[PDB]
Amino acid sequence: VIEKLSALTSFDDIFFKELKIKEYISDPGFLNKDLIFGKFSGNTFLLTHPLFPRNLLSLLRLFKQAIVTCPNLPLNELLEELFSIRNRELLLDISFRILQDFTRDSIKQEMKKLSKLDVQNFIEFITSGSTQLFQLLSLVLDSIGLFSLEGALLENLTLYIDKQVEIAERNTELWNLIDTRALPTYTMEYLDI
Amino acid sequence: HFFFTDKYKPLLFVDLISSNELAIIERNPLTFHSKQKAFIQPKLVF
Amino acid sequence: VKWCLIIHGGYLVSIPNLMSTLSSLHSTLKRRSDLLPRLLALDARLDCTINKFKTL
Amino acid sequence: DHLSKIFLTISKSITQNPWNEENLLPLWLKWLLTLKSGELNSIKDKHTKKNCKHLKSALRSSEEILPVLLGIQGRLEMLRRQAKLRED
Amino acid sequence: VAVVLELYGNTLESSPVLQELMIDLKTKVRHEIHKSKEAQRIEGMLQLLT
Amino acid sequence: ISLPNFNHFSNSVSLAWSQDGSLIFHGFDDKLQILDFDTFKKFESLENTKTVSEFTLDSEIQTVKLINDTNLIVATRTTLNAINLLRGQVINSFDLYPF
């Protein structure tokens, strides 16, 4: 297989044939039982290797394959791809990614290093147009701290999160609402014929 | 043809008060006026 | 207990051991936060039934 | 079964727009699930229950969203108090 | 209390002296919706200083 | 205490302990972690000879057992491997998938 990968789904047969023609638990067990060299040579097959087993290279189709199924990604490029305001649901995907990958203190210090202008841009963009998203907002707030945050933007964030927590309490109440002698002394009744 | 109603199991006096109106004078012996204390033989429901 | 974190909050950032000096407040606010969804569910069931016997 | 048709429409609507700010459609859900819940539970067993578990998953997700909203609410109230301290 | 409620729905609508106790319950079950809801809010602005 | 908060959850975890009590191996799903004992952070080595604290592996780790401070046998959901600790080079591996 090494000679194949040097001269260039299923076990290793289909992937090797695909590589030679272009030149996944079972696939992982067949091509992981040298790996760094194979990855460097290869860099579809990239997608399979990402799903199975150069973080800066992963930083530099395969975009979503990396932000969903890449083993090693650094938080600086991760928040760069997150704070890119393209919004192809990348906000939710990379928020889920950072919460899956790293620690709250790490995100705190990373967004301490991160600039304030894109912080204000992301706050305005979230307030304009999700537990991961609001955990990211709480992370943004306790990373920027106590001093530098605009009053008008604070009023906007107050309005946003207040109306949202009203509607969220409403939604929880309705959700669990979905989760939920003899005859008198004298009456008048008629019979059939 | 005929019919017999089983919706009135206790009854003291049935008659015709008026041109068509009936009187079914029923009873309720235990649940209202007597209320004499009965023995507690508990039925295991589970 | 809000105003303690409001006015001396810079000193509370400046202290190195926040959870160590304030394990008890974290404990009680976490315990209340833990109770919150279950009592919210209860309150939903309560509201459903009380509107049921208001309307009938 | 007019009310069951209404329930189908409003259940699909709350699955489509989970974060809508309007109140009369949640109030209609409140009235239906308050008065005639067991009747609907005897009415239909497969399609309304599939839509019901889907909307239950969505509203449970919103229940997961809730506490951090409470947290940032406490943070913005603290920031408002600190701002009044700064002005005074 | 939820189990007793799901058991005794209509005896509750037949009896009035328990109705005044539930309206007494609704005004006191709202302080964890106020004070313990504020307990989570302070828990949010306590992590800000961390 | 080492307290992160991961939004994803998987029962594919384990931990091993070096016999002299300095480092902790942690088997996460698709991830091997190395923890210091004094500060509960990653193994920050000042020499930087690619013995990093975050190793990538193929599948869900099921066990991590060090036979000594020299050899570390890590068996995943699909593959078993045997690495060294002084040098960060792999030595042995076996397919645990067909069984």
Most A CBs within 10 A among D17, D62, D63, D73, hence the mutation to make, goes to D62
What is the maximum alpha-carbon separation in chain B? 54
Relative orientation angle of helices A151-179 and A131-144, to the nearest 10 degrees: 150
What are phi and psi for residue A81, nearest 5 degrees?
-70, -30
* Spatial distance between the Cα atoms of A116 and A148, rounded to a whole number of angstroms: 8
Q: What is the layout of strands, in order, in the sheet containing F71-76? A: F14-17, F23-36, F54-66, F71-76, F79-84, F90-95
What letters, b where the CB count within 10 A reaches 16 and e where it falls short, cover F21-42?
Answer: eebbbbbbbbbbbbbeeeeeee
| A129 SS3 class | coil
Across the interface, whether the CB atoms of A145 and C37 are under 8 A apart is answered: no
Per the listing, tokens 């301290």 go with: D85
* Spatial distance between the Cα atoms of A126 and D72, rounded to a whole number of angstroms: 14
- A136's CB contacts (< 8 A; 6+ apart) are A82, A95, A98, A99, A107
Question: How many residue contacts between A and E have a Cβ separation below 8 Å?
Answer: 8
R_g of chain B computed on alpha carbons: 18
Using a CB–CB cutoff of 8 Å, tell me whether A42 touches chain E. no
From the list B5, B28, B31, the residue facing A191 with the nearest CB is B5
Q: Say how many CA atoms lie within 13 Å of A58 toward its Cβ.
A: 24
- A41's CB contacts (< 8 A; 6+ apart) are A5, A6
β pairing state of B13-16 and F23-36: unpaired
> What DSSP assignment string belongs to chain F?
------SS--S--EEEE-TTSSEEEEEEEEEEEEEESSSSSB---SS--S--SEEEEEEEEEEEEESSSSEEEEEESSEEEEEESSS--EEEEEE-S--
- Nearest Cα to A106, choosing from F71, F5, F54? F5
Among chain A, residues having any CB pair with chain D shorter than 8 Å are 130-131, 134-135, 137-138, 141-142, 146, 149, 151, 154, 157-158, 161-165, 167-172, 174-175, 177-180
CA distance readout (Å), A49 to F39, F56, F78: 34, 11, 15
β pairing state of B13-16 and B22-25: antiparallel
Per the listing, tokens 């008659």 go with: B15
Q: Do chains E and B touch (3 or more CB pairs under 8 A)?
A: no
What are phi and psi for residue F47, nearest 5 degrees?
-80, -30
Across the interface, whether the CB atoms of D78 and E45 are under 8 A apart is answered: yes
What letters, b where the CB count within 10 A reaches 16 and e where it falls short, cover F63-93?
Answer: ebebeeeeebebbbbbbbbbbebeeeeeeeb
Displacement of CA F51 from its chain's centroid (Å): 11
What are phi and psi for residue A149, nearest 5 degrees?
-160, 135
* Spatial distance between the Cα atoms of F7 and D17, rounded to a whole number of angstroms: 25
Query: For B14, which DSSP code?
Result: E
* Spatial distance between the Cα atoms of F16 and F27, rounded to a whole number of angstroms: 8
Displacement of CA B21 from its chain's centroid (Å): 20
* Spatial distance between the Cα atoms of D46 and D8, rounded to a whole number of angstroms: 12
- Nearest Cα to D67, choosing from A143, E29, E43? E43
User: Which chain C residues have a beta carbon less than 8 Å from that of E39?
Assistant: 28-29, 32-33
* Spatial distance between the Cα atoms of B13 and A4, rounded to a whole number of angstroms: 105
* Spatial distance between the Cα atoms of A57 and A43, rounded to a whole number of angstroms: 9
Q: Find out whether A192 and B3 touch, Cβ atoms under 8 Å.
A: yes
Closest residue in E to C19 (Cα–Cα)? E50
User: Which chain A residues have a beta carbon less than 8 Å from that of C40?
Assistant: 169, 172-173, 176
What letters, b where the CB count within 10 A reaches 16 and e where it falls short, cover A16-26?
Answer: bebbeeeebbb
> What DSSP assignment string belongs to C1-56?
-HHHHHHSHHHHHHSS-HHHH-HHHHHHHHHHHHHHHHHHHHHHHHHHHHHHHHH-
Q: Is the dihedral of CA A88, A91, A93, A98 positive or negative?
A: positive
> How many residues would you count in chain C?
56
Using a CB–CB cutoff of 8 Å, tell me whether C4 touches chain E. no
* Spatial distance between the Cα atoms of F54 and A101, rounded to a whole number of angstroms: 11
From the list A145, A146, A177, the residue facing C44 with the nearest CB is A177
* Spatial distance between the Cα atoms of F82 and F34, rounded to a whole number of angstroms: 16
Across the interface, whether the CB atoms of E37 and D77 are under 8 A apart is answered: no
* Spatial distance between the Cα atoms of A121 and A128, rounded to a whole number of angstroms: 10
Structure tokens at A159: 């309005």
- Nearest Cα to A91, choosing from A114, A115, A67? A67
R_g of chain F computed on alpha carbons: 13
Structure tokens at D4: 């069951």
Q: E12: how many CB neighbours lie within 10 A of its CB? A: 19
Structure tokens at C26: 């974290």
Q: F15: how many CB neighbours lie within 10 A of its CB? A: 12
Structure tokens at A17: 């044939």
Across the interface, whether the CB atoms of F6 and A104 are under 8 A apart is answered: no
Residue F29, amino acid: D
Structure tokens at C47: 């509201």
What letters, b where the CB count within 10 A reaches 16 and e where it falls short, cover A152-189?
Answer: eebeebbebbeebbebbbbbbbbbbbbebeeeeeeeee
* Spatial distance between the Cα atoms of E36 and C30, rounded to a whole number of angstroms: 10
Q: Say how many CA atoms lie within 13 Å of C55 toward its Cβ.
A: 11
Q: Is the dihedral of CA A85, A87, A93, A96 positive or negative?
A: positive
**Helices and strands (H, E) in chain D, number of each type:** 4, 0
The DSSP element (H or E) to which D17 belongs, if any, is: none
User: Which chain B residues have a beta carbon less than 8 Å from that of A191?
Assistant: 5, 22
Q: Find out whether A141 and E48 touch, Cβ atoms under 8 Å.
A: yes
Q: Find out whether F74 and F62 touch, Cβ atoms under 8 Å.
A: no
Q: Find out whether F21 and F37 touch, Cβ atoms under 8 Å.
A: yes
* Spatial distance between the Cα atoms of D2 and C44, rounded to a whole number of angstroms: 26
Q: A84: how many CB neighbours lie within 10 A of its CB? A: 13
* Spatial distance between the Cα atoms of D36 and C48, rounded to a whole number of angstroms: 11
* Spatial distance between the Cα atoms of C9 and A109, rounded to a whole number of angstroms: 18
Across the interface, whether the CB atoms of F58 and A99 are under 8 A apart is answered: no
Structure tokens at C39: 């009592």
| B44 SS3 class | coil
Residue F44, amino acid: E
* Spatial distance between the Cα atoms of E43 and F58, rounded to a whole number of angstroms: 39
* Spatial distance between the Cα atoms of B36 and A43, rounded to a whole number of angstroms: 92
* H helix runs in A117-186, sequence order: 117-128, 131-144, 151-179
